[PDB]
Amino acid sequence: MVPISPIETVPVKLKPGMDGPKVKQWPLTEEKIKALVEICTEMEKEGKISKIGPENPYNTPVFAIKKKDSTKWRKLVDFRELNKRTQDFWEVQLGIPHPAGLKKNKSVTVLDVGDAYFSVPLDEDFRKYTAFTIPSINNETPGIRYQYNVLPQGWKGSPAIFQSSMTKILEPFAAQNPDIVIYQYMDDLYVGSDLEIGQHRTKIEELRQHLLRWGLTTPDKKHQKEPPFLWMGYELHPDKWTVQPIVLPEKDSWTVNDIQKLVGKLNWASQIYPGIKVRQLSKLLRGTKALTEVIPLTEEAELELAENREILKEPVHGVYYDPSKDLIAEIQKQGQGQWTYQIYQEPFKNLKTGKYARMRGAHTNDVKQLTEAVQKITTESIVIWGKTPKFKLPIQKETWETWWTEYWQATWIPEWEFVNTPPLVKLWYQLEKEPIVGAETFYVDGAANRETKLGKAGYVTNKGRQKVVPLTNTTNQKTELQAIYLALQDSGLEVNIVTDSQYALGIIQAQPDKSESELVNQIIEQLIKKEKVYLAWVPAHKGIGGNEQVDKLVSA
Amino acid sequence: PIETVPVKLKPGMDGPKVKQWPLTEEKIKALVEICTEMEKEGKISKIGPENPYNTPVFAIKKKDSTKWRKLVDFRELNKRTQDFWEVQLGIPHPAGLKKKKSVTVLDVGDAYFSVPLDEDFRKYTAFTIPSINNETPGIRYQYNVLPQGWKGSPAIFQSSMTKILEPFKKQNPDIVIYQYMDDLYVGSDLEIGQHRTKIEELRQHLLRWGFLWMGYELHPDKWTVQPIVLPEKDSWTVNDIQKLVGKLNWASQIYPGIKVRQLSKLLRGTKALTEVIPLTEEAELELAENREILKEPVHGVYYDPSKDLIAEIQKQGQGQWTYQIYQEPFKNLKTGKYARMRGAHTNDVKQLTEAVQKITTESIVIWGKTPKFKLPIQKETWETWWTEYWQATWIPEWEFVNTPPLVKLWYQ
Ligand SMILES: Cc1cc(/C=C/C#N)cc(C)c1Oc1nc(NC2CCN(Cc3ccc(S(N)(=O)=O)cc3)CC2)nc2ccsc12
Numbered sequence: 001m002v003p004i005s006p007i008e009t010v011p012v013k014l015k016p017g018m019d020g021p022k023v024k025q026w027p028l029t030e031e032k033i034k035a036l037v038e039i040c041t042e043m044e045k046e047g048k049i050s051k052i053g054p055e056n057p058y059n060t061p062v063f064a065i066k067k068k069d070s071t072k073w074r075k076l077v078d079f080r081e082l083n084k085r086t087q088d089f090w091e092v093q094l095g096i097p098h099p100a101g102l103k104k105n106k107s108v109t110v111l112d113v114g115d116a117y118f119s120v121p122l123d124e125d126f127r128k129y130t131a132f133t134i135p136s137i138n139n140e141t142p143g144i145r146y147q148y149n150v151l152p153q154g155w156k157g158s159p160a161i162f163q164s165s166m167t168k169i170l171e172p173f174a175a176q177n178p179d180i181v182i183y184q185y186m187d188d189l190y191v192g193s194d195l196e197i198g199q200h201r202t203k204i205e206e207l208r209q210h211l212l213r214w215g216l217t218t219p220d221k222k223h224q225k226e227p228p229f230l231w232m233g234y235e236l237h238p239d240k241w242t243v244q245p246i247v248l249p250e251k252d253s254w255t256v257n258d259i260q261k262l263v264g265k266l267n268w269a270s271q272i273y274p275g276i277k278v279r280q281l282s283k284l285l286r287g288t289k290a291l292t293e294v295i296p297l298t299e300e301a302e303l304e305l306a307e308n309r310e311i312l313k314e315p316v317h318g319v320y321y322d323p324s325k326d327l328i329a330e331i332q333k334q335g336q337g338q339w340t341y342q343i344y345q346e347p348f349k350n351l352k353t354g355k356y357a358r359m360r361g362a363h364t365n366d367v368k369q370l371t372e373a374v375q376k377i378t379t380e381s382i383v384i385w386g387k388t389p390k391f392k393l394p395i396q397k398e399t400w401e402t403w404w405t406e407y408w409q410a411t412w413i414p415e416w417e418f419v420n421t422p423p424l425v426k427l428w429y430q431l432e433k434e435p436i437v438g439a440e441t442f443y444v445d446g447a448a449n450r451e452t453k454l455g456k457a458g459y460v461t462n463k464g465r466q467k468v469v470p471l472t473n474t475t476n477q478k479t480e481l482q483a484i485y486l487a488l489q490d491s492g493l494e495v496n497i498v499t500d501s502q503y504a505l506g507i508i509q510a511q512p513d514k515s516e517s518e519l520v521n522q523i524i525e526q527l528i529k530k531e532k533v534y535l536a537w538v539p540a541h542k543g544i545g546g547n548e549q550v551d552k553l554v555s556a
Numbered sequence: 557p558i559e560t561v562p563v564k565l566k567p568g569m570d571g572p573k574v575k576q577w578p579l580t581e582e583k584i585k586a587l588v589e590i591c592t593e594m595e596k597e598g599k600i601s602k603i604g605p606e607n608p609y610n611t612p613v614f615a616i617k618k619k620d621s622t623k624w625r626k627l628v629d630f631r632e633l634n635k636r637t638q639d640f641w642e643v644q645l646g647i648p649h650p651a652g653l654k655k656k657k658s659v660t661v662l663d664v665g666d667a668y669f670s671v672p673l674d675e676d677f678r679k680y681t682a683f684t685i686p687s688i689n690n691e692t693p694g695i696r697y698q699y700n701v702l703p704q705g706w707k708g709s710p711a712i713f714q715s716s717m718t719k720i721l722e723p724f725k726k727q728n729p730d731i732v733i734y735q736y737m738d739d740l741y742v743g744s745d746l747e748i749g750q751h752r753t754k755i756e757e758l759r760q761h762l763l764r765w766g767f768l769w770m771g772y773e774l775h776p777d778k779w780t781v782q783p784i785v786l787p788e789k790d791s792w793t794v795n796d797i798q799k800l801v802g803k804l805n806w807a808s809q810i811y812p813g814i815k816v817r818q819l820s821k822l823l824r825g826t827k828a829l830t831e832v833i834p835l836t837e838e839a840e841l842e843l844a845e846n847r848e849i850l851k852e853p854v855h856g857v858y859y860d861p862s863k864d865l866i867a868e869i870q871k872q873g874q875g876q877w878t879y880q881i882y883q884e885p886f887k888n889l890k891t892g893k894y895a896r897m898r899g900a901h902t903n904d905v906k907q908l909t910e911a912v913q914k915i916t917t918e919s920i921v922i923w924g925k926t927p928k929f930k931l932p933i934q935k936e937t938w939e940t941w942w943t944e945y946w947q948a949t950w951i952p953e954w955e956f957v958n959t960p961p962l963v964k965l966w967y968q
């Protein structure tokens with residue numbers, strides 16, 4: 001006998017104040033009972049379960065299931081109830097590596113650790129809660145009662161405890177063999193390196209000698225897989241990666257279900273196919289829970305789909321990461337709040353691509369969106385590669401300087417250079433800091449009746465120009481913007497505008513270049529046409545000249 | 557200190573489960589080195605999967621030091637930790653601290669690692685050194701001793717601290733010494749020579765009781781509520797008078813007695829904004845009467861320790877930042893301005909992060925707690941970058957302002 005080290009036990013508890021499960025065993029056919037007795041007799045011989053007396057008061061139901069041509073019975077212990085009552089664990093497997101962050105490992109071996117799994121002992125004080133009962137033949141004897149000594153498949157803690165147990169065992173080997181990578185996926189242990197085949201096989205043998213310290217035997221996986229690894233929806237090739245085939249279905253009838261999967265395929269594709277767009281196709285799912293409502297496609301969704309098929313016609317691939325080279329992120333504006341990007345180290349050899357869609361909001365501008373895209377890519381790049389990339393952005397250095405020095409919020413984007421890739425991001429208007437000498441002064445105001453929704457908007461100027469327009473189905477806030485719009489429409493290329501509307505000032509000072517409000521949009525269009533605009537605010541109802549005059553004109 | 561002081565969470569609350577945010581490779585490497593040494597020294601231990609809790613960590617560099625330092629963001633744990641009435645009913649916040657000519661900040665967080673943490677509470681201090689690209693499970697640890705930045709540490713250690721200082725306090729009755737979290741604030745009214753000597757005398761005294769060698773120096777003499785000032789001009793345009801009436805109208809929300817009728821009278825008509833308007837005698841008197849009102853303090857301003865402090869900040873351009881601290885609107889307890897922030901002439905976010913730390917430090921000296929910030933920045937920009945410039949062992953709370961306030965003009 002070669003002494004072997006025990007696998008350290010994880011202590012486990014039920015949730016506070018909860019007892020173990022007490023679920024009644026279902027009646028089973030004589031055939032199923034016979035099958036369960038043989039399965040459990042074998043499991044008991046292997047140490048996985050033990051027979052228990054009748055003093056244990058807990059129970060979980062057991063079932064017997066089959067397969068189509070697989071003609072033997074399967075045991076199923078349904079731990080749903082125990083799982084509800086078991087403490088939460090650190091689930092150490094939630095996120096998966098992005099392929100573009102992996103580094104080349106010429107040699108990879110796949111080891112089966114399915115057998116090692118059963119060397120992980122279940123906390124002895126918790127085993128009582130896993131009891132189950134094989135009903136007896138004709139219910140004429142006491143049922144055969146067992147409990148688990150190993151991690152039950154289907155029990156809440158098994159994945160996290162199995163994973164944490166293997167990691168701890170593997171830790172000294174990884175630490176002392178920095179030239180190999182080790183990654184576990186369920187029962188598969190992937191061991192890679194960039195060594196010559198002979199040296200690689202030696203590291204594998206050394207790893208097996210290491211795992212034997214705990215009595216773990218780990219043969220190579222059955223039917224060794226030729227590249228590429230089909231994993232988590234990717235194709236991992238030795239020198240490249242891509243997504244698995246993106247096939248867009250052809251259809252004359254699209255439902256809410258069809259479009260959801262189309263976006264999902266498109267979204268998945270966007271990590272390597274540059275320029276994917278999903279705005280128009282997403283707008284068709286705004287609010288609806290019926291998944292078979294056939295939603296017709298707009299001509300804009302049709303164009304977007306056709307543009308994606310052109311992008312998807314041919315496979316593309318990403319490269320793996322070289323830490324000795326720079327990391328570069330390039331962004332392009334696509335329109336309608338959509339942005340795409342590429343991250344690469346060498347020109348034309350993308351590590352990955354991606355996209356960014358404008359946030360939901362009433363007003364926004366391209367510089368803010370570009371900034372948001374940069375922060376998103378920054379955080380993604382820290383996740384994947386542990387560093388911020390150098391940015392190439394379609395915005396002139398002078399435009400950025402003007403923006404951040406004048407904008408009322410603090411803002412920052414990390415090291416970047418301008419790339420002349422139209423359409424360029426620009427500032428569409430800039431308000432004056434001081435009143436303009438020689439420019440006409442428009443005092444604007446609007447008001448509306450809260451009940452009738454009747455309103456007025458207008459202006460008076462220092463030249464005696466005046467206008468009041470009666471309005472229907474409006475609001476105070478709307479009449480105040482309308483007044484500003486009229487002053488812009490009716491003035492020359494330079495204009496001073498005086499408003500008492502804190503609301504309108506707050507919208508315009510936010511420097512939107514686009515809005516969900518057609519009125520704001522029309523104001524933006526007017527501002528773009530001016531040479532100089534000074535916008536001044538005064539408090540309402542204080543007797544300020546000009547403002548008092550127009551206020552009375554629009555208040556009935 | 558073999559005995560541990562029992563600690564519990566608040567009733568009906570579980571431990572924190574805060575996601576670890578992604579870290580750069582150099583910060584991960586720094587944390588691995590730091591935590592390996594802390595583990596060798598017994599300060600922390602590896603934990604297993606039966607511990608589901610988590611608190612974020614990151615890596616920083618203190619004021620002008622090149623060594624990486626570990627910072628745990630215990631904000632969630634601190635609000636889930638029982639309220640502490642540590643050795644008494646409370647430390648009456650020393651109102652004389654803010655009056656000393658000079659206040660020196662001494663990092664004494666090292667003292668905490670000599671006191672063991674209650675064994676049943678340790679699991680709640682769990683944290684993770686993350687992996688890059690999810691390529692390995694994070695490195696999981698929990699504390700075995702009082703952690704820096706945790707609310708319980710100063711309270712559980714306060715008995716020991718008062719004794720370590722008593723001999724120094726005995727000989728120096730005129731020096732105010734205040735502890736907030738990991739920091740000691742040492743105030744006196746003598747020249748830096750004798751002040752620094754006293755400070756270096758205090759750290760030597762501390763070194764014989766079981767350090768850091770670093771310090772910060774403040775001058776709370778100057779902190780007040782800055783007056784509202786009005787322009788003094790020989791010729792006023794229409795625009796000038798409109799800005800003045802707007803500012804006075806804002807001030808009338810703070811001060812009683814402010815009038816604008818005679819100033820508004822000057823604008824009778826529909827005049828060009830750049831037209832020069834002579835002040836009447838009535839308007840001059842009204843302006844003078846407003847100036848006199850604004851020389852006096854605001855009515856009914858008092859600190860209520862049961863309410864949050866709120867700090868607002870405005871970007872004024874050219875490296876200048878104005879801020880106000882209050883509990884109720886228009887009842888400012890303190891206002892101020894910052895300029896030429898050091899080492900960030902081209903980085904707004906670094907400047908804002910430095911202003912937040914300076915304002916928090918002033919708040920600790922004056923009231924013994926940190927304010928809730930209203931930050932003029934988009935959430936995603938702030939949360940991507942602020943840890944890059946953070947140098948304090950505490951972290952305040954903050955919220956984001958997305959609509960530009962008109963008040964920026966009035967503090968201009
Ligand atoms: C090692 C490993 C394997 C898989 C596969 C699952 C499946 N199904 C997944 C992950 C996350 C792995 O984990 C890491 N993988 C890498 N790099 C990779 C290694 C594999 N190659 C692809 C490849 C290479 C050689 C052959 S070959 N010629 O042997 O047939 C076939 C395929 C790309 C880079 N780096 C790290 C670092 C820390 S973990 C980890």
Ligand SMILES: [Mg+2]
Nearest residue numbers: 445446540551
């Ligand atoms: Mg009005």
